[PDB]
RNA sequence: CCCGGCGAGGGGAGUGAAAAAGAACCUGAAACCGUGUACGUACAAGCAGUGGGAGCACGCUUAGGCGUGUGACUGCGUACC
RNA sequence: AGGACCGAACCGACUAAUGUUGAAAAAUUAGCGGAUGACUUGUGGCUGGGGGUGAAAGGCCAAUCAAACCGGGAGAUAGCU
RNA sequence: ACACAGGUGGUCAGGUAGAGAAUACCAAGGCGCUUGAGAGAACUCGGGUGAAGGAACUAGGCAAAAUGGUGCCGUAACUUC
RNA sequence: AAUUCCUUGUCGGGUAAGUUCCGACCUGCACGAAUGGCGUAAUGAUGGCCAGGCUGUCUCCACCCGAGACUCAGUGAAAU
RNA sequence: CGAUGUCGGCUCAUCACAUCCUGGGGCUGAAGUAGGUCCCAAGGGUAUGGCUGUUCGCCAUUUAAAGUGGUACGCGAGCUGGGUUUAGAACGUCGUGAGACAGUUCGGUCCCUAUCUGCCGUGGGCGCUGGAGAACUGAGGGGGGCUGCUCCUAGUACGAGAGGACCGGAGUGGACGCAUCACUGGUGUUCGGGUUGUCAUGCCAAUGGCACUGCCCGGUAGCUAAAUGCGGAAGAGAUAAGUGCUGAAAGCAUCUAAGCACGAAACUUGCCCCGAGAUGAGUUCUCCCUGACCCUUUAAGGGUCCUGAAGGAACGUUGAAGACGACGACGUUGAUAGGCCGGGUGUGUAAGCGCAGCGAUGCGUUGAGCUAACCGGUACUAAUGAACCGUGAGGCUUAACCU
């Protein structure tokens, strides 16, 4: 359960440490985000020298939120960080190669299958 | 709303509602039967009434349980000595209540709340 | 096609075998006795009028326990009529079980919501409140304008005000029939029915085919 | 906040047209002591439903 | 009531194991894909339990890739397929909320014994 | 003298020309508020009247005829300075 | 040592809420500042209205101040309502 | 103007915790603040708690939250040192 | 510029976005040297801007504790 | 001018259509895709922030779109007081000056207990022409009406390729709204634990009081969203724009004049809800009352005694019902409430004793002790014999049967 003006986590090697969105997307007014979405963010906080730069706006998808998310016999997997990993603009698809932390089956798709390949643990 | 609530206010917090019927049950208990008002009568039998069943077993850790509640050894002492053995073998209901009309100052709905058992 | 007598015995899950938990609502169907066929010839429309159950027979009376001696049949615990569907045909002393209800997958239950008592605007209208800080005083809660500058000058009707939230005839629709338990006169329902425990209600089918 | 004309007194009637109030209906007569208190409150006497219940 | 938990009694699992909160446990968990029921495990501290007889419940945290993983489990849901008590824990308080950010040295539970 | 709290206040009884002179005392207007009678009044829109007028009640009476009170319905009609 | 520091009393009155037919013709509540000094306070004393006094703001001079209050001219005057 | 949350100068200084006339609980001592009795809607007053988010709110982080003790370690720009 | 009309001047900073601020630029409508000028540590319930912390400020409110509101009894205003 | 407060915001709006998304056409300088334009269509929908008091605008990034106006530039007896617009103060500027500047800057009291209309609720009266109790009927009125994306059809039609459809279907969203607490949570100052200071219980032990619930950690019921069910229709009818059919007037032609069709989120519906004060008070089913008499102004009249039904009301216990009312359930025949019993729940191994240890403490007894609203029971208490109300067969007029 993600809104805009919150800090989230870089879950990969994409560069950056520190981000923060600014628009949630896929439809209008909707308020909050979770997993497996597609989130516009800036990036406050960069390495020296990474792929990424600080104040860089991209997209990212969400992978993992301190709210947690259900299973169908109602179980909820709840983490302690809310951790997104970087996309794409327009191919709309990573831009690290090394994915930082666990992930869940929410994740998993046609459209995620390269980052739960690069993943080091899927819940 | 309050549904499927229990307990009444009393215009009262808490803390008054508490060392009030720590007040009343002292005060029944030494004379069996006193004059209060309906809204007081009805609840303070959710208060003496298990205090009667707590009083159908003389554990010296009861003895240290009816002080806590009322730290008052006297009816301490005349729970246990009397009114365990007295309602033995009631299962519950070891009061009565007589709703005896109205307050003179305020008009307000008096009633008599009794033992069973008291004469 | 009729509907059907329940009762809001409660909300709890099944699990399937596959791991999904569906939260369903227990309502028990018992004997809906019918009492009353209205018809064309009397009254001008098909309908049966049913009762289920019993009450306290120092309860019922006498012009209620006649109508059910003119049936025949016992004295329920309240009087419901559905109106029939054509061919849909019903003898009087005919009790129905829930086993009408073993080939619907969608059906709609009709219940008296509970009693919210008298609602605020903002929680019956889901209206805003104002700021809690930033100078507000005593309008924290307050819907604020009602109408306008005279030139419709009054208040008008149907306007979202105060007042009692609740405690009326709604109707969920679509649900889903998970298991009708036609042994013990139960009934395995997904969705949350309106009402609280232990209210009447009532279960016709889907009505949207 | 105030009235922009007077009240007629036939409303203050119309106003006051409920607020009329109620007697009592019947009163419970003792069946020992014979005399008549309130349904369901005891006597002036300590009698409720004939018996004594309270010594006063 | 009398037929709510006539509808729960026949869903229960038989095969529960008793435990306490703070004992490390394990838990198999179902997992399938295409038609690939692989059983994948998952392991942890137990810091809360929910009992509600059918509608019972549990919480499992563990420390995953250096992040904290919790995953509460429905007690007698099917998808779970086995819950093994790894080690008992000696704990004193019912629900383990402090251990959610206790990491480390903190993290620590001496093991019961009695 | 009776009620009442030994009250308050009243009711007798007496006084006096008179107490509808009783001391909150000549006379008691209006506003205001009663209590009773009458008639109207619970599908009906507006300075509240007026004009017409059903009925009821009611006085003379010759209940004819009318007075009186009420105003069913209806025409007209937006206070005053 | 200090128009030194923190901070009670004390002395303020900064912010916010309340209150606004108020508990109150300015206060309460919560925080606020100063708090050995250009401090604060008791008892007196003095300065009088075109005058006083004023770390000045027309500020203050008995709930009254760009000219105090009271009495007198005085039934000021009013091409106005 | 009130049996009015205001104002009013001096004196007296128990115990425990505590640097303290801070507080906090008490003693001595004095009270229970002149309508109650219920009910436990909205709303308002005063409060407490809050998932995820952390100022985006807003004119404005107003208000709230938060910080806070002692001992020790440590401490920049600049400085009129 | 507490002074700049034009003017959200231009450039730079900052922000994702900055009519604010900060630093330049001087084209100073209409700076200016004791009605002082330009600085300045310290100071400030001083103005503005930025961050961290912090949180019902907000998203989006939810619940509970008291005080009223409401019922009854006694009392019993107001403005208009 | 004996007072009509205005900028902007906020909270609530509502209307228009001169239509932003959505819907339907027509033409194209419309291959398709994408458009252009005009017509029909107002049912629904129709951003957030940076900036600045703003409005506006600029910008960032969304949407399917980020419609335009009317409403005292809607909305202060609803809020905000930043802008404007009092007194304080300063600069620029002007004026000798006092002073002033749609020059700027700093600071700067937002009263109103609702009589009426109104509106949301909830009642009482009376009526509906014997009384009563239910079932309704459904006049009317209200709710509701959004859309994305993905896939299929199919990389097909189209197209040189690039690109890429119609139509038809599926799946999943967003936004909204309803139901709701099974789940996830929150709360849960009535349950349990922890802990500080102090006071008290003769004292220890053990408690309690007070310290924001003293400070915590938890947490039942309920209440709750962030939790999770469902909704938006389909269909029908008449249509708008528009497309036609046949077809004269007018030997042709012509959608029109006769006749016939099609046609949109608009309309009527269809869905939900209200609903006989629908005075036009409707319908159905049930139940109850079958006395004597006088009186005169005979009258749909006055009274007396007899009778008091169905039932209703009142009373008590009460509710997941509730401001109060109203509504529901129960009142001994009785589970209505309370207690009780069993449970469950949460809390977490009481106290007492034993043990170890100088002791703090730890171990044993001991998942102990306890447990709010809960589950199942239990009449143990409190739900009284009454009494009350409401009566005694129900006007006229026809007709239509039957006598
Ligand atoms: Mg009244």
Redesign the pocket.
């Given at each position: 359960?993600?809104?805009?003006?919150?800090?989230?986590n870089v879950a990969d090697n994409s560069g950056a440490r520190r981000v923060?969105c600014?628009?949630?997307?896929?439809?209008?007014?909707?308020?909050?985000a979770?997993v497996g979405d597609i989130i516009?963010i800036?990036?406050?906080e960069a390495i020296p020298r990474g792929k990424v730069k600080?104040?860089?706006?991209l997209?990212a998808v969400v992978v993992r939120?301190?709210?947690?998310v259900?299973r169908p016999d109602?179980?909820?997997i709840?983490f302690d960080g809310?951790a997104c990993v970087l996309l794409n603009?327009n191919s709309e698809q990573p831009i690290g190669t090394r994915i930082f932390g666990p992930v869940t089956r929410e994740l998993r798709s046609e459209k995620f299958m390269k980052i739960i390949s690069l993943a080091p643990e899927v819940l | 709303?309050?549904?499927?609530?229990?307990?009444?206010?009393?215009?009262?917090?808490?803390?008054?509602?508490?060392?009030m019927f720590?007040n009343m049950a002292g005060s029944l208990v030494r004379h069996e039967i006193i004059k209060?008002?309906?809204?007081?009568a009805?609840?303070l039998?959710?208060v003496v009434?298990?205090?009667?069943?707590?009083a159908?077993t003389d554990?010296?850790?009861?003895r240290?349980?009816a002080?806590?509640?009322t730290?008052d050894?006297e009816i301490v002492a005349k729970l246990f000595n009397e009114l365990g053995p007295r309602f033995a073998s009631?299962?519950?209901?070891?009061?009565?209540?007589?709703?005896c009309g109205f307050?003179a100052?305020?008009?307000?709905?008096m009633?008599y709340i009794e033992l069973?058992d008291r004469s | 096609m009729i509907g059907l007598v329940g009762k809001?015995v409660?909300?709890?899950?099944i699990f399937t075998e596959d791991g999904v938990?569906?939260?369903?609502?227990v309502i028990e169907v018992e004997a809906n006795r019918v009492?009353?066929v209205?018809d064309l010839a009397?009254?001008?429309?098909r309908?049966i009028?049913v009762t289920t159950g019993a009450?306290?027979?120092?309860?019922?009376?006498?012009?209620?326990?006649?109508?059910?001696?003119?049936?025949g049949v016992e004295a329920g615990?309240?009087?419901?009529?559905?109106?029939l569907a054509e061919g849909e045909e019903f003898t009087v002393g005919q009790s129905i079980s829930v086993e009408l209800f073993a080939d619907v997958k969608?059906v709609?239950?009709?219940?008296?919501?509970?009693?919210?008592?008298?609602?605020?605007?903002?929680?019956?209208?889901?209206?805003?409140?104002?700021?809690?800080?930033?100078?507000?005083?005593?309008?924290?809660?307050?819907?604020?304008?009602?109408?306008?500058?005279?030139?419709?000058?009054?208040?008008?009707?149907?306007?979202?005000?105060?007042?009692?939230?609740?405690?009326?005839?709604?109707?969920?629709?679509?649900?889903?029939v998970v298991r009708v338990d036609a042994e013990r006169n139960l009934l395995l329902?997904?969705?949350?029915?309106?009402?609280?425990?232990?209210?009447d209600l009532i279960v016709?089918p889907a009505?949207?085919? | 906040?105030?009235?922009?004309?007077?009240?007629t007194?036939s409303?203050?009637?119309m106003?006051?047209?409920?607020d009329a109030?109620?007697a009592?209906?019947?009163?419970?007569?003792?069946?020992?002591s014979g005399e008549?208190?309130?349904?369901?409150?005891?006597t002036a006497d300590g009698y409720?439903?004939?018996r004594k219940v309270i010594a006063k | 009531?009398?037929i709510?938990?006539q509808l729960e009694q026949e869903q229960m699992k038989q095969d529960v194991p008793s435990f306490?909160?703070g004992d490390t446990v394990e838990v198999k968990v179902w997992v399938v894909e295409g038609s690939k029921k692989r059983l994948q495990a998952f392991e942890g501290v137990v810091i809360?339990?929910?009992?509600?007889?059918?509608?019972?419940?549990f919480?499992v945290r563990k420390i995953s890739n250096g992040e904290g993983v919790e995953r509460?489990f429905?007690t007698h849901s099917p998808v779970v397929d086995s819950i093994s008590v790894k080690r008992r824990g000696?704990?004193?308080?019912?629900?383990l909320?402090?251990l959610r950010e206790r990491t480390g040295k903190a993290a620590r539970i001496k093991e019961?014994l009695?």
């Open positions: 359960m993600i809104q805009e003006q919150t800090m989230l923060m600014i628009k949630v997307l896929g439809g209008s007014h909707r308020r909050y979770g516009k800036t990036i406050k600080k104040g860089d706006v997209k939120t301190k709210k947690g259900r109602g179980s909820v709840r809310n603009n | 709303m309050r549904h499927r609530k229990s307990g009444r206010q009393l215009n009262r917090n808490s803390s008054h509602r508490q060392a720590r209060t008002t309906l809204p007081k009805k609840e039998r959710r009434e298990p205090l009667i069943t707590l159908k554990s010296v850790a009861n240290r349980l002080f806590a509640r730290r050894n009631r299962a519950g209901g070891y009061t009565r209540i007589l709703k307050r100052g305020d008009n307000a709905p009633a069973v | 809001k409660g909300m709890t899950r938990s569906i939260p369903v609502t009492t009353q209205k009397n009254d001008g429309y309908a009028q009450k306290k027979a120092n309860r019922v009376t006498k012009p209620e326990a006649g109508h059910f001696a003119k049936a615990r309240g009087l419901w009529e559905f109106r969608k709609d239950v009709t219940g008296t919501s509970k009693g919210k008592g008298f609602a605020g605007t903002v929680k019956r209208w889901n209206f805003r409140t104002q700021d809690a800080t930033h100078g507000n005083s005593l309008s924290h809660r307050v819907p604020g304008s009602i109408g306008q500058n005279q030139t419709p000058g009054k208040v008008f009707k149907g306007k979202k005000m105060a007042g009692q939230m609740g405690n009326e005839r709604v109707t969920v629709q679509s649900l889903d329902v997904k969705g949350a029915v309106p009402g609280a425990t232990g209210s016709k009505v949207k085919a | 906040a105030v009235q922009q004309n007077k009240p007194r409303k203050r009637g106003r006051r047209s409920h109030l109620t009592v209906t019947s009163l419970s007569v003792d069946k020992t008549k208190h309130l349904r369901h409150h005891i409720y439903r004939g | 009531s009398n709510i938990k306490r909160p809360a339990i929910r009992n509600r007889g059918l509608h019972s419940a919480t509460v429905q000696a704990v004193r308080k019912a629900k909320y402090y019961r009695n």
